[PDB]
């Protein structure tokens, strides 16, 4: 191709969206945004194929541009806006709040949450670096840059971000015994406690995770998201609690 692609065909779309193969020929291509294309759920899919409030497209469009939908507390009007893991979708008119969290099957689940929990989110610290004028900042998994962070925050840690102000309220270090969520692979959606982090210089780091049932599984570090300490998650968990 001579430039960026703009079309996504249904068979080539992510499997977890659960799009009918005979409904059409194309699938909603997620626009550029906070999350990866393959790891994002466009708002059209959420409103139509999951919540069933909309039957089809321009009704999703109309819902959006009445400004009823808020992603992380901000109004969005793009049908293919790439909402992703741990995004808060608020519908004031119906009085609903949702957090995008995969189920054990590995697909985004419709998980209703309270307003108090909807007031915040968690971000995995992808990067920590000094900016211009000697200003430290942290880049999270959703592309949020937060300046002036706590010094104790390092990469692979998890920062609790307040949506209204976009500031860090608390943080969780990456250590053994922490409660952890799998965000990719075949173990995608499972929840466990850290046991060991195997380190390979110049290679991908591997982490061992033990579930509440004492079953153990190993996963790459890029697929790891701390959510709390064992027995005290900082967010409400879907049904099944990431078991099996």
């Amino acid at each position: 191709a001579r430039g960026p692609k703009k079309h996504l065909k249904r068979l080539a779309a992510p499997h977890h969206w659960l799009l009918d193969k005979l409904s059409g020929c194309y699938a909603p291509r997620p626009s550029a945004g906070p999350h990866k294309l393959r790891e994002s759920l466009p708002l059209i899919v959420f409103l139509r194929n999951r919540l069933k409030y909309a039957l089809n497209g321009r009704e999703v469009k109309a819902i959006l541009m009445q400004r009823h939908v808020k992603v992380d507390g901000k109004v969005r009007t793009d049908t293919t806006y790439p909402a992703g893991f741990m995004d808060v979708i608020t519908l004031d008119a119906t009085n609903e709040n949702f957090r995008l969290v995969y189920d054990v099957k590995g697909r985004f689940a419709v998980h209703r949450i309270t307003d108090e929990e909807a007031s915040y989110k968690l971000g995995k610290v992808k990067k920590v670096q000094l900016g211009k004028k000697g200003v430290p900042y942290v880049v999270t998994h959703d592309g949020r840059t937060i300046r002036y962070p706590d010094p104790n925050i390092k990469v692979n840690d998890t920062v609790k971000i307040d949506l209204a102000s976009g500031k860090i309220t608390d943080f969780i270090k990456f250590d053994a015994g922490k409660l952890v969520y799998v965000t990719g692979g075949r173990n995608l959606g499972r929840i466990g406690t850290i046991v060991h982090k195997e380190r390979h210089d110049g290679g991908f780091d591997l982490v061992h995770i033990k579930d509440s049932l004492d079953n153990t599984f190993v996963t790459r570090l890029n697929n790891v998201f701390v959510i709390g300490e064992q027995g005290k998650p900082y967010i409400s968990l879907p049904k099944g609690k990431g078991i099996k």
Partner: peptide, 19 residues
């Protein structure tokens, strides 16, 4: 934190017969 309590369906089936 606990998940939001489930809300019962607001609307229910309504029935009518004629002719």
């Amino acid at each position: 934190p606990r998940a939001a309590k489930k809300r019962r369906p607001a609307a229910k089936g309504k029935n009518l017969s004629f002719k």
